[PDB]
Design a protein around this ligand. Structure first.
Ligand SMILES: *[C@@H]1O[C@H](CO)[C@@H](O[C@@H]2O[C@H](CO)[C@@H](O)[C@H](O)[C@H]2NC(C)=O)[C@H](O)[C@H]1NC(C)=O
Ligand SMILES: *[C@@H]1O[C@H](CO)[C@@H](O[C@@H]2O[C@H](CO)[C@@H](O)[C@H](O)[C@H]2NC(C)=O)[C@H](O)[C@H]1NC(C)=O
Ligand SMILES: *[C@@H]1O[C@H](CO)[C@@H](O[C@@H]2O[C@H](CO)[C@@H](O)[C@H](O)[C@H]2NC(C)=O)[C@H](O)[C@H]1NC(C)=O
Ligand SMILES: *[C@@H]1O[C@H](CO)[C@@H](O[C@@H]2O[C@H](CO)[C@@H](O)[C@H](O)[C@H]2NC(C)=O)[C@H](O)[C@H]1NC(C)=O
Ligand SMILES: *[C@@H]1O[C@H](CO)[C@@H](O[C@@H]2O[C@H](CO)[C@@H](O)[C@H](O)[C@H]2NC(C)=O)[C@H](O)[C@H]1NC(C)=O
Ligand SMILES: *[C@@H]1O[C@H](CO)[C@@H](O)[C@H](O)[C@H]1NC(C)=O
Lengths: 593, 191
């Protein structure tokens, strides 16, 4: 009966936050002072945190959720009462752990040997990805691309065929009919009236929005092909799919590195302010205080003071072992702080706006219950950061914050040079981001059997992404597993939904700001309503669902892609004049070999 | 049985918030009364917002009730540098559950396992029954709402405030007041 469940979770919320704090304190102290003495401390603190968390879950399981009426207490019971893991038999749990550890060590240690010189070998990031990012030798890239698959990707095959078993038996035991349906469960909403939402409806609404991208992507693809035909002549058909080893990284996940090969107006320099940052001699403190000047200018809260003493923004003065990975920390107890290795660059100034934009989220819902202090779905928690990055990248912010001179000028040739680099990043990944989740969803449900895994993958690379296998593959390979998101057990639909929500969250506040032009030109500074309509959602976290939270910011009951497509109508207006003698989209049937 | 310089507390620079709930802060010198008690305790900064006349929530319903008709004052100040510890200063204790709502000025120091809904209970605090006492692990890195505040309450004959005295002018026509007797005249040193 509900007061037992209230008092049980009120006791969880008073018990848990202390243990969460002295666990995350050792983790903070480790990442800033890396020593085995701090590894062992953060290990043995994180152990006691987990030993509390798993015990409180089997206690929460004794309370029948059908005796509840209140919505709050119900969502906190359902968050703590959930198994997920520990439903497996003890041996099969260790077998899944053994597979996960094996796919983790294979991806992290996977050496590729040079056949011209067997004594030189490359790891993925420190060399093999560098070839794909910054070399134009088709055969050095094609070697790096197929040798990752043949010398590392092949190792993951027999493991993914057994991870897909143990993860589905885990999902089933939880009464999710496949592990894909389990990952779709983040977006689910029940009993709120009208604003309810379904695991299967996530498939239907992703596929209902994906077809609105295709007319833009098939012009941007024909454009990227017409430019790659000049960087890689004779290798590419004028109507073809794109050979995968030519897409700018180890998988073709973003086209952003193709800019120097694809740029609209290479004769005009795209905007920078790294020069004005060093002309005024700014540091990390100034960069982040100019970001707080942006946040108080739209009229969001100031930092809680202890941000400045307890954050780390540059490297230390000692040649100290610390991670340079820019990370937003919520420790509990109201303690919000950023850890990073910063360098005086306009990219780091946008970072400051982005990571302080994450801290504004972590700060706003801090009065909500602990089990509810998270993003309303896994796409919201990054979309709320990137609106602060994009508002700060604009020539209006950059001139008015004094980072561009009053007599700097911008032109239509500059506007399209920006928008194409946005599209190569934002539009080019959406096909891949729908495709990877769709292939996994169809594998976990068994619509693709293990004797058609690599077959359907490349049929979908050719039908969804317009991309063709550089070299033939069969069921001895595992190109999905050759990527981090598959071999280390990560859901990926967060990137599709975030790449929708970022532009919804932009355009909603551009209306409130009385914005006068194309959606990219928008700035939410000096305004009140643009901070106020946002704060109404930011104070929620998980305490109200994402379907309802969209109606408070945007006035939309569900997710949309129109706002994203409106951020590209000026670029599509340009593509429609450049591409007139191009074959729009692709022939699925061409191949390079 | 003492003269109470209360307005010197109100004028001092150390305190973060101070208020009075039956009296104005300038009249704190003018007060005179039979007996008073002073209370003191250490609490989290956002929870000091419950420590005013008649309010609800946590401390006000389960530890320490102030009435709506409180003739008195409350004073609160930040204390990180002495009252917080890196390991969490769990010496400070708070109550999360108790039956009924506290009478104004009620104290309790006993405990029994809470048994919400209905159940027997003999230790263990496992299911449907809870140990209601909890500890406040204060740390010097906390956000302001969770930092330690030192808090005092004043629960307003034997205790007048300070009786101000002027200079004493001799050999001139003056109005005067000596203790409680008032008059007018010329004051001269007698034999
Ligand atoms: C990393 O942090 C640890 C602990 O925070 C430091 O190790 C010791 O810390 C104690 C404080 O409790 C000092 O009294 C010792 O002198 C420290 N050890 C040494 C060898 O100095 C450690 O110093 C920090 N790392 C660095 C590079 O300073
Ligand atoms: C159960 O739901 C009710 C409302 O549906 C919540 O009641 C509110 O509680 C807060 C503090 O607990 C009060 O300040 C509000 O005034 C209450 N609202 C109303 C309309 O009375 C209640 O909090 C929920 N239970 C829990 C444990 O959160
Ligand atoms: C969590 O998983 C267990 C199965 O491992 C679910 O079933 C319970 O299993 C235990 C033994 O581990 C039995 O003592 C219980 O009787 C089972 N539950 C019931 C309802 O009879 C358990 O129900 C799962 N949790 C949830 C939320 O369903
Ligand atoms: C940028 O703006 C200028 C001025 O509007 C554009 O120049 C016009 O281009 C069209 C199409 O070729 C011609 O019909 C006009 O004659 C041009 N104007 C003049 C005054 O000659 C220019 O093409 C624009 N470029 C982009 C990328 O938008
Ligand atoms: C937007 O906010 C900025 C920051 O307050 C305003 O910048 C001020 O502009 C005036 C005149 O343009 C200067 O005299 C001040 O020195 C500026 N302040 C700072 C801190 O640099 C700007 O005016 C605001 N925009 C509008 C339209 O009001
Ligand atoms: C934020 O801090 C600045 C000083 O750095 C101050 O001027 C401003 O008033 C503060 N913001 C608000 C909302 O008061």
């Amino acid at each position: 009966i509900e007061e037992q469940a209230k008092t049980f979770l009120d006791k969880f919320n008073h018990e848990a936050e202390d243990l969460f704090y002295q666990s995350s304190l050792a983790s903070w102290n480790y990442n800033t002072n890396i020593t085995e003495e701090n590894v062992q401390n953060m290990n043995n603190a994180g152990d006691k945190w987990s030993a509390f968390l798993k015990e409180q879950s089997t206690l929460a399981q004794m309370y029948p959720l059908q005796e509840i009426q209140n919505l709050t207490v119900k969502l906190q019971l359902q968050a703590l009462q959930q198994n997920g893991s520990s439903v497996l038999s003890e041996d099969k749990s260790k077998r899944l752990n053994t597979i996960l550890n094996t796919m983790s060590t294979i991806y992290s240690t996977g050496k590729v040997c040079n056949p011209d010189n067997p004594q030189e070998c490359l790891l993925l990031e420190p060399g093999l990805n560098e070839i794909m990012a910054n070399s134009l030798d088709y055969n050095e890239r094609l070697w790096a691309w197929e040798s990752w698959r043949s010398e590392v990707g092949k190792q993951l095959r027999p493991l993914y065929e057994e991870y897909v078993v143990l993860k589905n038996e885990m999902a089933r035991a939880n009464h999710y009919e496949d592990y894909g349906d389990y990952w779709r469960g983040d977006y689910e909403v029940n009993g709120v009236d009208g604003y309810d939402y379904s695991r299967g409806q996530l498939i239907e609404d992703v596929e209902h929005t994906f077809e609105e991208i295709k007319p833009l992507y098939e012009h941007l693809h024909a454009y990227v092909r017409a430019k790659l035909m000049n960087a890689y002549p004779s290798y590419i058909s004028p109507i073809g799919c794109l050979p995968a080893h030519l897409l700018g990284d180890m998988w073709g996940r973003f086209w952003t590195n193709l800019y120097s090969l694809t740029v609209p107006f290479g004769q005009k320099p795209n905007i920078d302010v790294t020069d004005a940052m060093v002309d005024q001699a700014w540091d990390a403190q100034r960069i982040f205080k100019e970001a707080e000047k942006f946040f108080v200018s739209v009229g969001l809260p100031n930092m809680t003071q202890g941000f400045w003493e307890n954050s780390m923004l540059t490297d230390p003065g000692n040649v100290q072992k610390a991670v340079c990975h820019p990370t937003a920390w919520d420790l509990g107890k109201g303690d919000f702080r950023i850890l990073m290795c910063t360098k005086v660059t306009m990219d780091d100034f946008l970072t400051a706006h982005h990571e302080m934009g994450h801290i504004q989220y972590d700060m706003a819902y801090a009065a909500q219950p602990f089990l509810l202090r998270n993003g309303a779905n896994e796409g919201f928690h990054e979309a709320v950061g990137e609106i602060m990055s994009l508002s700060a990248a604009t020539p209006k912010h950059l001139k008015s914050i004094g980072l561009l001179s009053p007599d700097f000028q911008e032109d239509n040739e500059t506007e399209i040079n920006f928008l194409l680099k946005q599209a190569l990043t934002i539009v080019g990944t959406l096909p891949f981001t729908y495709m990877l989740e769709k292939w996994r969803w169809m594998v976990f449900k068994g619509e693709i059997p293990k004797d058609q895994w690599m077959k359907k993958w490349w049929e979908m690379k050719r039908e969804i992404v317009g991309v063709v296998e550089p070299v033939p593959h069969d069921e001895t390979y595992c190109d999905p597993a050759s990527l981090f998101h598959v071999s280390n057990d990560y859901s990926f639909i967060r990137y599709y939904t975030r790449t929708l929500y970022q532009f919804q969250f932009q355009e909603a506040l551009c209306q409130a700001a009385k914005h006068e032009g194309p959606l990219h030109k928008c700035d939410i500074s000096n305004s009140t309503e643009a901070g106020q309509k946002l704060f109404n959602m930011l104070r929620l976290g998980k305490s109200e669902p994402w379907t309802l939270a969209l109606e408070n910011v945007v006035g939309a009951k569900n997710m949309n892609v129109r706002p994203l497509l409106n951020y590209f109508e000026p670029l599509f207006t340009w593509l429609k004049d450049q591409n007139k003698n191009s074959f729009v989209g692709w022939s699925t049937d061409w191949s390079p070999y | 049985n003492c003269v109470a310089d209360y307005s010197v507390l109100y004028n001092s620079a150390s305190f973060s918030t101070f208020k009075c709930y039956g009296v104005s802060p300038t009249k704190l010198n003018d007060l005179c009364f039979t007996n008073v008690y002073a209370d003191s305790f250490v609490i989290r900064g956002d929870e000091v917002r419950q420590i005013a006349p008649g309010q609800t929530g946590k401390i006000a319903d389960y530890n320490y009730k102030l009435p709506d008709d409180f003739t008195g004052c409350v004073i609160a100040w930040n204390s990180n540098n002495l009252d917080s510890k890196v390991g969490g200063n769990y010496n400070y204790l708070y109550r999360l559950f108790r039956k009924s709502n506290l009478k104004p000025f009620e104290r309790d120091i006993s405990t029994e396992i809470y048994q919400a809904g209905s159940t027997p209970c003999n230790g263990v605090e496992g299911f449907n029954c809870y140990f209601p006492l909890q500890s406040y692990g204060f740390q010097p890195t906390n956000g302001v709402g969770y930092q330690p505040y030192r808090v005092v309450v004043l629960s307003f004959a034997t205790v007048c405030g300070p009786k101000k005295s002027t200079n004493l002018v001799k050999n001139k026509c003056v109005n005067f007041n000596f203790n409680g007797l008032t008059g007018t005249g010329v004051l001269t040193e007698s034999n």
